[PDB]
Amino acid sequence: IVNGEEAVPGSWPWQVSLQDKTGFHFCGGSLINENWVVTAAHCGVTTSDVVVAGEFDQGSSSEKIQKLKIAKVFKNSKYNSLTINNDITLLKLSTAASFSQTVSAVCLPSASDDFAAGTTCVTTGWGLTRY
Template sequence: GCGVPAITPVIRGYNRIVNGEPAVPGSWPWQVSLQRYDGFHFCGGSLISENWVVTAAHCGVRTTDTVVVGAYDQESPSPDEQRLTIEKVFKNPKFNMLTIRDDITLLKLATPARLSATVSPVCLPQATDDFPGGMTCVTTGWGLTDPN
């Protein structure tokens, strides 16, 4: 099923996004890297099915970019890594770069990701789902964010 990593993540402390902590390899199997034609990583996203990725509209993804799934270390390719072509970019037409409102884009993959222990989709909530205060939530990404 979605949202259940085959490799158990370790969640220590409750740091904010800035000064996060390294992940256990493969423990966030829906985390993708968005890369330009030259392999430059510019944004992250989440695999929501074998054919779809959700990311931020402010990333400015193009069909010439690549979705990398199954990666762990940006500096050394993983044996489970898949480099996938983007068929179509669906950027929210209401996105406003000045206010960063409606900051969402869907990416349709040209070929489906091969699902495995290190590549699987995250679950999307239903509109009626309720998340009580105090519930543990985790944000994943590709590195530290400068607080300045």
């Protein structure tokens, strides 16, 4: 993010980080279940990448994390690589994450409901604070 602030650590129970195996964070994601996850499709997630949860910093010599192995990528049928419409993906995990004070799940909308303009929402992540 550009122009954010340090959230409260574990302030966001649901936030994951996505590492490849050069052990590097490439994309964000959200925990729906103990078993399941949601991310973006343009992220090019494979069975070979990792989900990290209940983390804070990446400098950690070690934090009390959860390095979780992927099972099956559930890509979206409709991801359009020029459009970027239907930019979604799902992750089933070899193992579940255990819900603590820090790790937990985001609630879901329905296609029925309205989240009207002018509404104050939030966004989190380890993206660039400066371009």
